[PDB]
Each structure stands twice: as C-alpha cells, then as structure tokens.
Amino acid sequence: HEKVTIAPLVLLSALDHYERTQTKENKRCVGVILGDANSSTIRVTNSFALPFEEDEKNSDVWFLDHNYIENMNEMCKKINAKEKLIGWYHSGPKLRASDLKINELFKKYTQNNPLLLIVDVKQQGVGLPTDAYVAIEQEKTFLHLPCTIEAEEAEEIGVEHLLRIRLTNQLKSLKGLQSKLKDVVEYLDKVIHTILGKLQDVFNLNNLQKALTVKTNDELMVIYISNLVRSIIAFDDLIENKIQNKKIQEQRVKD
Amino acid sequence: TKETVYISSIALLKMLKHGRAGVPMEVMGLMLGEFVDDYTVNVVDVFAMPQSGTGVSVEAVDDVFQAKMMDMLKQTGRDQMVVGWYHSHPGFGCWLSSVDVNTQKSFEQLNSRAVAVVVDPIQSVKGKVVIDAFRLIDTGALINNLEPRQTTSNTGLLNKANIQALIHGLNRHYYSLNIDYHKTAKETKMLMNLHKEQWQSGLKMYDYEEKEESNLAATKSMVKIAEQYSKRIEEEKELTEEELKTRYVGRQDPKKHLSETADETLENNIVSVLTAGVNSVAIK
Amino acid sequence: VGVNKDSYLILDTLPSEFDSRVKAMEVDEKPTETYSDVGGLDKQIEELVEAIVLPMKRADKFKDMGIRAPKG
C-alpha cells in the first residue's frame, strides 16, 4: 500500500472553514488537497474549502462547482509551483451517493488517484479526526491508509509557542481492547466473513512455550540488576548530604 | 489610538510558511479580516502574493491577482476588507525590510489600518517566534490620541529595547509594536490533538509498546552490555574524589553519572515490566 | 550569464557586450605590403610560401591525396 502524511495546518484550516460557512448537520463541506503524490507517501501541503451544497434526505442532490477549481489552480501557480492537486477531502462521517459520484470529477484535474479524506468536525473518539482513504475497484471500495501527522521544523516549533509514561500507555492500550469487543458485536448483528477471515488469521500468530517461560524471569532478573544501579543513584545522595552535614556542623562553631 | 494585532493559530502558521523558502529570497502576502480601530484587531485568512522583478515593493501588489482572489475567497465567507500585508526578509537591527521604506505611506492612503509584517528568523525560530510589523504614524505622538495605554509600550529605556538597535523610535515614528496570539474553542482541541509536544497518537496501544517492547530488536538489546555501560560511566567519575576534598578540582562529578544512569535505569525497568504487562493472552 | 545577486540563481543569458576583449589588439583587413620591401629574407620567404601560402591557396588538391596541410 501507500502512506499519507497530513500537516497540522491543513486540518486546522479545514475545520474553521466548516464554521465560516455556517454549515449545519444537514449539509457537509468538501474541499481540495494539494501536495506531491508522486512519491509513495502522500503529503498535503495546501487545502481550500469549496461551496458544496447537499441535501441529507436525498442522496441524488449535490452541488459542486468546477469553475472555482480552475481559477484557484491558476492562482496557486503564482504562489507555489511545486503544489498540484492530489485529490479532494470532504466532511461528515457518512459516505453517500454525493461523495462517490464526485470522486471522478476531481480525477479530471488530478493525475494520480485522488486521496479521499473523511473529516470529523466534532472530533468523536480516540485520535485522528481525519482518516486517509484510497479509491480502488475490484463497486467502489475505499481502503484505509496509515495517516501520520508530521510538519516542518519551524511548523512544529511555531505551534509549541501557541500552547506555551507507564500508566499512559496502559490506559491507551485498554481502550483498544474495548473497541475490539464492540467491533465483533456490532458486526455480528449486521450479518444476521471477509473481516472475520483476517481476524481468525492473526489470532493464532506450552509445547513450544515450555522454554519460553524462562525468558519472562530473565528480564525480571535484569530489573533487579537495574534496581541495583537505581539504588546506587540514591546511594550517592546518601553520601551527598553528609558532604553538607560536615559543613553544617562547622557553622554553629563559627557563630 | 494604536491597534493591538491579534493573530490566531490559523494566520500565524500560514504567514510563516509562505516566507520559509530561502534565506535571501523575499516574498509577500495579503492579510484579510474584519475589525474596528480602538485596540482590537483580527486576521481571518491570508494568502501569498506573486513576486515581481522588484521583489518586495509597493508596485509588487497586483490589483488583477488581488481582485481574482477576493472573488475566490468569497465562496467560504472568508472575504473581508484589506487589513494589511505581510512580507519576508532576512531581518536587520533597524528597517528589517531592505526595500520598503515609504511604501507604507501609499498603504496608509488606501487603508489606515494596513500594516507591513516582516518575519525576522526565516526558519531560525528557536521557539520564541518573534515577528516584526510596521505602521506609519506620520506626524504624531505630540498632543494627540495616546497610544501607549494598552500593553508593553513606552519602551526604549537606555539603549536596550527589543533587538536593542531600535531603542525608542523603533522603525519609523515609533509604531509601538504590539502582538498577541489567541486560540478559539476549535483551535484549542485541534492543535492539542495534532501538535502539542510530540504527536505519538494513533499508535496509542502500541505507542510505548511498539517503540520499546517491539523495538527490542536493536534498542536495549544486550542489556548485560547496557548495564556495563552504566558501570564505566559511574566508575569513571566516582574514582575522581573519594576523599571528599579538592584533588582533581571538580564539583558535580559525582552528580554527572547520577542523573545520566538514573533515567536510563528508569526506562530499562518500565519497558521490561510492560513486556508481559500488556497481556496479549498467548495461553498455548 | 544573468544570475541573482542574493540567491545566486541562474535566470537568463545575456548578449555579448563586455567580453574582456583585451583591447589594443591589431585588426587589419587585407593590409598593404610586398615581399620586395624587406629583402634578404627570400630564403625564409620561400619557406613561408611553401609551408603556408601555397597550401592556403587550394585545399582540395591536398585533400585528394589524403594528407593534411600545415596550419602554421
């Protein structure tokens, strides 16, 4: 597969455009992503929202203006010549006939496969308000791609000025197990096999583990060896304070 | 009175990124927003401007390009009046813009609220994020509206103010630089979920699991040799002063290996206890 | 070659104006002189006619032989 890296400036500007248009739940926002799709890792260096109109009760009602795309693309040529249209994003959790038919409309102005993005304006659950999705046919099949957040050197530093371990990983790991428990329940009521085929494949991945019991105690053996070094850390503080105590007793004498 | 500029998280990152190409190269852009004088000032959205043969100048503003953008920026409702311009220059002690001098005088005639912003660092930011703006006072600061009633003004004490080359007059006519940043409700939750210190999320279950227990291929591998490293670090400095007096002329030598091997051991124990602590339920 | 003063980037070439032509170079089209003005050099003048003047007249006669005429 491929990879997708989205800068935080793209997602920050995409959410405010939803507020600038005063779009309610009955409508969704659609926009275009710009970047370099030639490499294996798709990166979005620019984005802009489009005045997308849609009816929620009718999946056959959508409005997409292609005239603003041609003008905006010519205006970006005088800004950055390395920026081209790699695809288009959209808002809302649902994928309906409005978003599927417009996927081929942006394909005319996009050389490579347009990158599909579901943007969550309410930021509901976990992380990643926007997921990376690629369009492929065997019916439209949208496969998920790894979405990483990476910015430039001054971009990551500039955001830190705006905002200026063990238990953390455990609490985040337990939430993933709870999401899997509801994953098999919600899928079971939908059928009454493709996903279960991949699940049952990775489940199997003490006959051979009889010798694998010792490796647990081998790491615990080093922990006590580390605690021996960890104890030395405070053994010097045990010596360090007596370095003062000898000078402390020489104070009252001088007074 | 003067104006206090309030750049949000959206405008600061966009105006900066446009001027991050090259140390010597200079670019320019346009700021838009809707506010009133008498303190308050906002910036909605910005976009870069094309560079002419003169680089950054007053003639570099294209009325044809600017008119086409305001029509394209109307679709999302971000189209507003022109609140000023922002430029890019390497920066100096005084007059950071090597070209623009009186160009603001032609800008003040079009809009009295227009300013000229110049980014000094150009990818030199150490985390301070210091940017410079400009406003033409012309004849003022004598028997008129009192600017320094707001924040951080009446500077110029001795020879040291800001960069310390400006002192009192700053760039021209004491424009009284005031800059502040703010974050809305949407900008607060978005940035903290994207970039706060370092973004490890989306791996959250494997965050410290994959970076450590699954990275054991070569990370801490040969912990018996890793413990040997802590031995040589301690034995080196502990050998210095065993008499608790002045011999090798040192002070923090016993504390040098103390803090270094403490964080390493703390990481060695947490990763090791969480190897079987994840409880993948292997059974048989 | 036109380049930037700041970024030192090649933009467009320029026509030839100042080439550092090394002036005071004598350029004379078909001067007026005869070998009879300076005598006694007929021994060397003959060597100048054989190795220079005569092969300079017609190069097709020496080309049919396959050899190369001396250029100096």
Side-chain angles (χ1 to χ4, degrees):
Chain A
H1 61 78
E2 294 178 350
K3 294 177 179 177
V4 174
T5 299
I6 295 171
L9 177 62
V10 176
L11 296 176
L12 178 63
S13 178
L15 177 62
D16 183 67
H17 297 166
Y18 176 78
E19 183 179 2
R20 292 181 181 174
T21 59
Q22 294 300 321
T23 299
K24 294 177 179 177
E25 294 178 350
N26 291 337
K27 295 176 179 177
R28 292 174 296 181
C29 183
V30 175
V32 176
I33 57 173
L34 276 67
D36 186 6
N38 290 337
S39 63
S40 63
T41 299
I42 295 171
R43 182 177 181 171
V44 175
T45 59
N46 190 341
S47 64
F48 58 90
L50 294 175
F52 178 80
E53 297 301 321
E54 183 180 2
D55 186 5
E56 183 178 2
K57 294 176 179 177
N58 190 341
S59 63
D60 290 343
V61 175
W62 62 88
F63 177 80
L64 177 63
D65 186 4
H66 62 286
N67 191 30
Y68 296 141
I69 297 170
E70 294 177 350
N71 290 336
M72 183 65 73
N73 191 30
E74 295 301 321
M75 297 298 103
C76 295
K77 294 177 179 178
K78 294 177 179 177
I79 295 171
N80 189 340
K82 294 177 179 177
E83 293 178 350
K84 63 182 178 181
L85 277 66
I86 59 173
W88 58 276
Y89 64 90
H90 64 80
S91 64
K94 293 177 179 178
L95 295 175
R96 296 177 64 185
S98 64
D99 290 344
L100 272 65
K101 301 299 182 181
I102 62 172
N103 191 30
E104 294 178 350
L105 296 176
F106 297 96
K107 184 178 179 180
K108 183 178 179 180
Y109 296 93
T110 300
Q111 294 177 336
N112 290 336
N113 189 340
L115 177 63
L116 188 146
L117 296 174
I118 292 176
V119 176
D120 186 5
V121 296
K122 294 177 179 177
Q123 294 177 336
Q124 294 300 321
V126 294
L128 295 175
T130 299
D131 290 344
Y133 295 133
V134 63
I136 186 169
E137 294 178 351
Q138 294 178 336
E139 183 178 2
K140 302 299 183 181
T141 299
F142 296 159
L143 296 175
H144 180 61
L145 296 175
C147 183
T148 59
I149 302 301
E150 183 178 2
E152 294 300 321
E153 294 178 350
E155 293 178 349
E156 294 178 351
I157 293 171
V159 177
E160 293 177 350
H161 182 62
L162 296 174
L163 295 174
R164 184 182 296 275
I165 295 170
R166 181 178 64 84
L167 178 63
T168 300
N169 190 30
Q170 295 297 101
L171 295 175
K172 293 177 179 177
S173 296
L174 296 175
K175 294 177 179 177
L177 296 175
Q178 294 177 336
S179 296
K180 295 175 180 177
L181 177 63
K182 294 176 179 177
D183 182 68
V184 63
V185 175
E186 293 177 351
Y187 177 78
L188 177 63
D189 291 344
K190 183 174 178 290
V191 176
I192 61 172
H193 61 78
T194 299
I195 303 301
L196 297 176
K198 294 177 179 177
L199 294 174
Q200 294 178 336
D201 180 67
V202 295
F203 292 160
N204 190 29
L205 177 63
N206 291 336
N207 292 336
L208 296 175
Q209 294 177 336
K210 183 178 179 180
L212 296 176
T213 301
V214 177
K215 65 182 179 181
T216 300
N217 290 336
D218 290 344
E219 295 301 321
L220 296 174
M221 182 65 72
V222 178
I223 295 171
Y224 176 77
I225 296 170
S226 296
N227 288 284
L228 177 63
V229 177
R230 178 60 179 165
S231 296
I232 294 170
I233 304 301
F235 291 162
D236 290 343
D237 290 343
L238 176 62
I239 296 170
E240 183 67 15
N241 293 337
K242 290 176 181 178
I243 297 170
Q244 295 300 321
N245 295 132
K246 62 189 183 70
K247 294 176 179 177
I248 293 169
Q249 294 300 321
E250 294 177 350
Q251 293 178 336
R252 292 184 182 175
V253 176
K254 294 177 179 178
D255 291 344
Chain B
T1 60
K2 64 181 179 181
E3 295 177 351
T4 299
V5 183
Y6 259 109
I7 300 164
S8 63
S9 296
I10 295 170
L12 178 62
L13 296 175
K14 292 177 178 177
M15 293 184 286
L16 177 63
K17 179 58 166 60
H18 297 166
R20 295 179 67 249
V23 175
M25 293 178 71
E26 61 184 343
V27 296
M28 65 174 284
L30 177 61
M31 294 184 287
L32 295 175
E34 182 179 2
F35 60 87
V36 180
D37 58 352
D38 200 343
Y39 170 71
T40 197
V41 173
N42 58 32
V43 175
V44 176
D45 188 5
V46 298
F47 59 89
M49 294 297 292
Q51 185 174 355
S52 63
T54 60
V56 174
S57 63
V58 62
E59 294 178 350
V61 176
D62 186 5
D63 290 344
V64 176
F65 178 82
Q66 186 173 355
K68 293 176 179 177
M69 294 299 293
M70 293 178 70
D71 290 344
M72 297 298 103
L73 272 64
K74 185 179 179 180
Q75 62 181 20
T76 59
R78 59 178 181 183
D79 186 6
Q80 294 301 322
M81 294 183 286
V82 174
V83 300
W85 290 272
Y86 63 91
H87 302 291
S88 178
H89 294 82
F92 296 97
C94 184
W95 291 96
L96 276 67
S97 178
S98 63
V99 177
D100 290 345
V101 175
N102 291 336
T103 62
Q104 185 64 58
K105 183 178 179 180
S106 296
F107 296 159
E108 295 301 321
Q109 294 178 336
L110 296 175
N111 189 340
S112 64
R113 297 180 182 174
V115 296
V117 177
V118 176
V119 176
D120 188 7
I122 307 301
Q123 294 177 336
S124 296
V125 177
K126 293 184 175 74
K128 294 177 179 178
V129 182
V130 176
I131 60 172
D132 188 6
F134 179 80
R135 182 178 181 273
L136 177 63
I137 306 301
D138 188 4
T139 299
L142 178 62
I143 304 171
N144 63 343
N145 291 337
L146 188 146
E147 295 178 351
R149 65 181 182 89
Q150 296 296 101
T151 301
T152 58
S153 180
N154 194 30
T155 59
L157 177 62
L158 296 175
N159 61 345
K160 295 176 179 176
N162 290 336
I163 299 171
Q164 297 175 338
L166 297 175
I167 307 170
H168 182 62
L170 296 175
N171 290 337
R172 184 178 180 172
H173 297 295
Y174 177 74
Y175 62 92
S176 179
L177 179 63
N178 190 340
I179 294 171
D180 187 5
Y181 63 91
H182 60 284
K183 291 180 295 296
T184 59
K186 293 184 174 74
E187 294 178 351
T188 299
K189 294 177 179 177
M190 181 65 75
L191 294 175
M192 293 178 181
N193 290 337
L194 294 176
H195 184 62
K196 183 178 179 180
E197 295 177 351
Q198 185 64 59
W199 180 84
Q200 294 178 336
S201 64
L203 295 175
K204 294 177 179 178
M205 66 176 285
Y206 295 139
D207 185 5
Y208 294 92
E209 183 178 2
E210 183 178 2
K211 185 179 179 180
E212 296 301 321
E213 291 82 357
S214 297
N215 196 30
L216 292 175
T219 300
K220 295 180 181 297
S221 63
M222 295 301 294
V223 295
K224 295 175 181 177
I225 296 171
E227 295 301 321
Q228 185 63 59
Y229 296 141
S230 296
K231 181 174 177 290
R232 294 182 182 175
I233 295 170
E234 293 177 350
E235 183 178 2
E236 183 178 2
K237 301 292 184 291
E238 292 177 350
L239 179 63
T240 59
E241 298 302 321
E242 63 186 343
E243 296 301 321
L244 299 175
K245 63 181 179 181
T246 59
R247 181 177 181 172
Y248 295 142
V249 183
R251 300 289 183 268
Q252 63 180 19
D253 291 344
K255 293 177 179 177
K256 293 177 179 177
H257 62 79
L258 188 147
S259 63
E260 295 301 321
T261 58
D263 290 344
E264 294 178 351
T265 300
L266 177 63
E267 294 177 351
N268 290 336
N269 290 336
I270 294 171
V271 175
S272 296
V273 298
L274 294 175
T275 299
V278 177
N279 191 339
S280 63
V281 182
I283 312 301
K284 294 183 175 74
Chain C
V1 176
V3 296
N4 190 341
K5 183 174 179 290
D6 290 344
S7 63
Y8 295 93
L9 296 176
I10 295 171
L11 296 175
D12 187 6
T13 59
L14 295 175
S16 296
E17 296 301 321
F18 177 80
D19 290 344
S20 296
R21 294 182 182 175
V22 182
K23 302 298 183 180
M25 176 179 71
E26 294 178 351
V27 176
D28 187 5
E29 180 180 1
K30 294 177 179 177
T32 299
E33 187 178 2
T34 58
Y35 295 94
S36 63
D37 291 344
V38 176
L41 295 175
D42 290 344
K43 179 62 174 172
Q44 295 83 0
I45 292 171
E46 183 178 2
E47 294 177 350
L48 294 175
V49 175
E50 292 177 350
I52 302 300
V53 175
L54 293 176
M56 181 173 174
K57 183 178 179 180
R58 299 290 182 268
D60 290 344
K61 302 299 183 181
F62 296 96
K63 183 178 179 180
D64 290 344
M65 295 177 182
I67 60 101
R68 299 290 182 268
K71 271 68 180 180

mmCIF file of all heavy atoms in Angstrom, chain A residues 42 51 99-100 135 149 153 183 194 200 253:
data_model
loop_
_atom_site.group_PDB
_atom_site.id
_atom_site.type_symbol
_atom_site.label_atom_id
_atom_site.label_comp_id
_atom_site.label_asym_id
_atom_site.label_seq_id
_atom_site.Cartn_x
_atom_site.Cartn_y
_atom_site.Cartn_z
ATOM 1 N N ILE A 42 1.969 10.066 0.458
ATOM 2 C CA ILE A 42 1.180 11.206 0.003
ATOM 3 C C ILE A 42 1.195 12.282 1.079
ATOM 4 O O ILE A 42 0.881 12.017 2.245
ATOM 5 C CB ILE A 42 -0.256 10.772 -0.332
ATOM 6 C CG1 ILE A 42 -0.257 9.807 -1.520
ATOM 7 C CG2 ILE A 42 -1.124 11.984 -0.627
ATOM 8 C CD1 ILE A 42 -1.598 9.154 -1.775
ATOM 9 N N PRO A 51 -17.628 25.580 -1.953
ATOM 10 C CA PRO A 51 -19.039 25.750 -1.575
ATOM 11 C C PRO A 51 -19.896 24.571 -2.007
ATOM 12 O O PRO A 51 -20.620 24.650 -3.006
ATOM 13 C CB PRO A 51 -19.439 27.039 -2.301
ATOM 14 C CG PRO A 51 -18.539 27.084 -3.489
ATOM 15 C CD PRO A 51 -17.232 26.488 -3.043
ATOM 16 N N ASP A 99 -20.784 11.876 -2.381
ATOM 17 C CA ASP A 99 -19.327 11.835 -2.326
ATOM 18 C C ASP A 99 -18.733 10.828 -3.303
ATOM 19 O O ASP A 99 -17.587 10.994 -3.733
ATOM 20 C CB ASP A 99 -18.866 11.514 -0.903
ATOM 21 C CG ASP A 99 -19.125 12.653 0.064
ATOM 22 O OD1 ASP A 99 -19.369 13.786 -0.402
ATOM 23 O OD2 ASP A 99 -19.086 12.416 1.289
ATOM 24 N N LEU A 100 -19.482 9.783 -3.661
ATOM 25 C CA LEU A 100 -18.945 8.762 -4.556
ATOM 26 C C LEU A 100 -18.930 9.226 -6.007
ATOM 27 O O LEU A 100 -17.984 8.927 -6.745
ATOM 28 C CB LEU A 100 -19.744 7.464 -4.418
ATOM 29 C CG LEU A 100 -19.305 6.463 -3.343
ATOM 30 C CD1 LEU A 100 -19.463 7.024 -1.937
ATOM 31 C CD2 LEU A 100 -20.074 5.158 -3.489
ATOM 32 N N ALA A 135 -9.205 5.179 -3.198
ATOM 33 C CA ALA A 135 -10.253 4.580 -4.014
ATOM 34 C C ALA A 135 -9.665 3.495 -4.905
ATOM 35 O O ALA A 135 -8.661 3.718 -5.589
ATOM 36 C CB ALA A 135 -10.951 5.643 -4.862
ATOM 37 N N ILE A 149 0.947 12.359 11.326
ATOM 38 C CA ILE A 149 0.964 13.810 11.463
ATOM 39 C C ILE A 149 2.419 14.240 11.596
ATOM 40 O O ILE A 149 3.065 13.972 12.617
ATOM 41 C CB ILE A 149 0.131 14.283 12.661
ATOM 42 C CG1 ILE A 149 -1.313 13.794 12.532
ATOM 43 C CG2 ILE A 149 0.174 15.799 12.774
ATOM 44 C CD1 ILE A 149 -2.011 14.272 11.277
ATOM 45 N N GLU A 153 10.202 21.866 10.338
ATOM 46 C CA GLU A 153 10.935 22.195 11.556
ATOM 47 C C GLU A 153 10.324 23.405 12.253
ATOM 48 O O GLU A 153 10.008 23.351 13.448
ATOM 49 C CB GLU A 153 12.408 22.445 11.231
ATOM 50 C CG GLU A 153 13.152 21.216 10.737
ATOM 51 C CD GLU A 153 14.592 21.515 10.372
ATOM 52 O OE1 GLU A 153 14.961 22.707 10.331
ATOM 53 O OE2 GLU A 153 15.355 20.557 10.126
ATOM 54 N N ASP A 183 -16.452 -4.285 18.420
ATOM 55 C CA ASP A 183 -16.290 -4.468 16.983
ATOM 56 C C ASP A 183 -16.893 -5.789 16.522
ATOM 57 O O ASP A 183 -17.495 -5.861 15.445
ATOM 58 C CB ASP A 183 -14.808 -4.394 16.611
ATOM 59 C CG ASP A 183 -14.574 -4.531 15.120
ATOM 60 O OD1 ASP A 183 -14.972 -3.615 14.369
ATOM 61 O OD2 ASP A 183 -13.994 -5.553 14.699
ATOM 62 N N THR A 194 -15.565 -11.660 5.454
ATOM 63 C CA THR A 194 -14.306 -11.152 4.917
ATOM 64 C C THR A 194 -13.423 -10.600 6.028
ATOM 65 O O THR A 194 -12.221 -10.889 6.082
ATOM 66 C CB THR A 194 -14.581 -10.079 3.863
ATOM 67 O OG1 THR A 194 -15.342 -10.644 2.788
ATOM 68 C CG2 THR A 194 -13.275 -9.523 3.313
ATOM 69 N N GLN A 200 -9.514 -14.182 12.251
ATOM 70 C CA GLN A 200 -9.143 -15.540 12.636
ATOM 71 C C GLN A 200 -7.751 -15.919 12.151
ATOM 72 O O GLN A 200 -7.174 -16.890 12.653
ATOM 73 C CB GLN A 200 -10.169 -16.540 12.099
ATOM 74 C CG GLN A 200 -11.547 -16.414 12.721
ATOM 75 C CD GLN A 200 -12.548 -17.382 12.121
ATOM 76 O OE1 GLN A 200 -12.387 -17.838 10.989
ATOM 77 N NE2 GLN A 200 -13.591 -17.703 12.879
ATOM 78 N N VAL A 253 29.711 26.505 65.034
ATOM 79 C CA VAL A 253 31.005 26.734 65.671
ATOM 80 C C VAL A 253 31.517 28.133 65.353
ATOM 81 O O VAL A 253 32.031 28.838 66.229
ATOM 82 C CB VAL A 253 32.010 25.649 65.242
ATOM 83 C CG1 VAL A 253 33.386 25.931 65.828
ATOM 84 C CG2 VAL A 253 31.516 24.273 65.661
#
